[PDB]
Amino acid sequence: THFDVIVVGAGSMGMAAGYQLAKQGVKTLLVDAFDPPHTNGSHHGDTRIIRHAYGEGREYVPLALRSQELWYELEKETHHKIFTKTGVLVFGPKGESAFVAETMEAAKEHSLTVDLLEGDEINKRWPGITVPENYNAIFEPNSGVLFSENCIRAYRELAEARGAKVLTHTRVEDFDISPDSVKIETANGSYTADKLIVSMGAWNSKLLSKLNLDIPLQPYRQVVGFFESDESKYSNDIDFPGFMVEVPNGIYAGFPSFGGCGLKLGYHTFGQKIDPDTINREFGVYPEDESNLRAFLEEYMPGANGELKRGAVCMYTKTLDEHFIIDLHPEHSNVVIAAGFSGHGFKFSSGVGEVLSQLALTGKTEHDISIFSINRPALKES
Ligand SMILES: *Cc1cc2c(cc1C)nc1c(=O)[nH]c(=O)nc-1n2C[C@H](O)[C@H](O)[C@H](O)COP(=O)(O)OP(=O)(O)OC[C@H]1O[C@@H](n2cnc3c(N)ncnc32)[C@H](O)[C@@H]1O
Ligand SMILES: [Cl-]
Numbered sequence: 001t002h003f004d005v006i007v008v009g010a011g012s013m014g015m016a017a018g019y020q021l022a023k024q025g026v027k028t029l030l031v032d033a034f035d036p037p038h039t040n041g042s043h044h045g046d047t048r049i050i051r052h053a054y055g056e057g058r059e060y061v062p063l064a065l066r067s068q069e070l071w072y073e074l075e076k077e078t079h080h081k082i083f084t085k086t087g088v089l090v091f092g093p094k095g096e097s098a099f100v101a102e103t104m105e106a107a108k109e110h111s112l113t114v115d116l117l118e119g120d121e122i123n124k125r126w127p128g129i130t131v132p133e134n135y136n137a138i139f140e141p142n143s144g145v146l147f148s149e150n151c152i153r154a155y156r157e158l159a160e161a162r163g164a165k166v167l168t169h170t171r172v173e174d175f176d177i178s179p180d181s182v183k184i185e186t187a188n189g190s191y192t193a194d195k196l197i198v199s200m201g202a203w204n205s206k207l208l209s210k211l212n213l214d215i216p217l218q219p220y221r222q223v224v225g226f227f228e229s230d231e232s233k234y235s236n237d238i239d240f241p242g243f244m245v246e247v248p249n250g251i252y253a254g255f256p257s258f259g260g261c262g263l264k265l266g267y268h269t270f271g272q273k274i275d276p277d278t279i280n281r282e283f284g285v286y287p288e289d290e291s292n293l294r295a296f297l298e299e300y301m302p303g304a305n306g307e308l309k310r311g312a313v314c315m316y317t318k319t320l321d322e323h324f325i326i327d328l329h330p331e332h333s334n335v336v337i338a339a340g341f342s343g344h345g346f347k348f349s350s351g352v353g354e355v356l357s358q359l360a361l362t363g364k365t366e367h368d369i370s371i372f373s374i375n376r377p378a379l380k381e382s
């Protein structure tokens, strides 16, 4: 059967696209290598931060705010848990964090509700945090934490109820694009449609070449660990925040303990360069997996440095500028590309789904997506 739209990669971005398309009666096929949500891509490890005041650049704020509303809509539509409003704390040494400074500028430019704190005010407000006196902070009370695997699962179940079809455990191997249709090849058969969305996460870095694109898209191995913690300090129940912070040796991001699961941490600015089909997915096979996390905890969050309860291994896919790619294919207006989310895309996946549906159906979007152009110079090596 010929579909209206085919989505290749039914993960964070593709499943949201599928939901958006199905809700409008568009006959959609989604094809995934696995059965999402799963532990082989970029969406597992339970939780994701959503921030509105945005240290990567104030121009992300409108998409973050739209995405936040879309997450509240999803919460109301499903029985799965979507969002909890932890707030997000950002801190770093005063005068020495571009990330903190841009977060602060973004909040001012968009009139976001934030608290500004410094030094011992941080340690007093949130027992369990120990920063130096020369640190400053911005705290965003109304952002928080998404349950990412639940988000994809809910979008899948809602899309399928409206007639979207999901073909699981099926790798797309090649493409054939014509002026008025698209075709995909798999070991389980070939499929056609009017429009294609390409959203294969870390595998975009290997398979966009089949669409005559050569864009730097390096996959990275990124681990997270959950640690036995002082629940009187680090529980969501006592208002411990989500956080993303800059210190001299890089950026870390973490989560309060939910229901006793332990504080979760990741080192965001370091990971191993990998290939998505040979990555070692076991936490702890490199000493740095656990040691880089405890180096942070023992200094800044010392009561959250107990036994390792759980570890996960997940992938980032970076562009050279660490901004996303969301655009039509430059040679094929019936092909939409979502790639290069550079370790910070999940929070936008609801809004991106809307963008991708608009691009597929109309060739345009009401959102300003200029900074995500596939033709920008900053994507290309010298
Ligand atoms: C790994 C990670 C990411 C991350 C994070 C922490 C970790 C450890 N913390 C974040 C946070 O707190 N807040 C946030 O906003 N983002 C954060 N991220 C990044 C975010 O998770 C990613 O940017 C995002 O998940 C990327 O989504 P995308 O949709 O691009 O990738 P995916 O969910 O892995 O989905 C891709 C799908 O494609 C399928 N696939 C692959 N190859 C094929 C072929 N050949 N054919 C068909 N399907 C294919 C995959 O199976 C997958 O389902
Ligand atoms: Cl990513």
Ligand code: NA
Binding pocket: 049, 050, 051, 244, 253, 344
């Ligand atoms: Na984040």
